[PDB]
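Quick entry between incubations.
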Amino acid sequence: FNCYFPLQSYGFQPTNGVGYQPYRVVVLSFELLHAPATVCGPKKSTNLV
Amino acid sequence: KNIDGYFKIYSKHTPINLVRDLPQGFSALEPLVDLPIGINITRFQTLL
Amino acid sequence: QVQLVESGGGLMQAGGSLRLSCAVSGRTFSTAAMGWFRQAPGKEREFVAAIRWSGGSAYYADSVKGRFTISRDKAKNTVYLQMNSLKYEDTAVYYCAQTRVTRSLLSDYATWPYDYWGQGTQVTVSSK
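Done. Structure below.
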């Protein structure tokens, strides 16, 4: 009484409503530090003028 | 210092001729290494 | 997949004691909680006691509370039911059960459908 396990399972059945169906989520967090930027886009480099 | 979980080290070495205490003067410390450790640190020790 | 094998049932006089074991085999890393249920001839199945595999916390039905102790051995993959002060009402077939399901409220395990069942072991309580 008043002493519960903090976690609980998801009920994932194929017949579940889309609201209750499982969804995989990846969150990308971008950030700048006291270092050169090491994650860059595919954007091609060019000669310097 | 540990900021956003990322360890930042700043260091400077100066030639001294003193056996007592910290010399009185001014010198800036240049950053050496930023480590993205993500490690919470509340205690430290010295190794000689 | 898991299989459950009860043992340690039989005859005993009212006011005496008995110890049921149930051995889990198969995918045992999947056990969340275990339960004991009983069913006398001609009456419906009834929840007895449940234990959470991690933490070893126990929930009991009111009829057995203070008389029965559920307990587990993680290492030996076995749940125990220590039945003391046996009574008329205790006579029944006892089933152990496993669920892969984590419920926050331990009481849930009284009413929640379990995943696997043993064949059962008979308990019978003699008349004085």
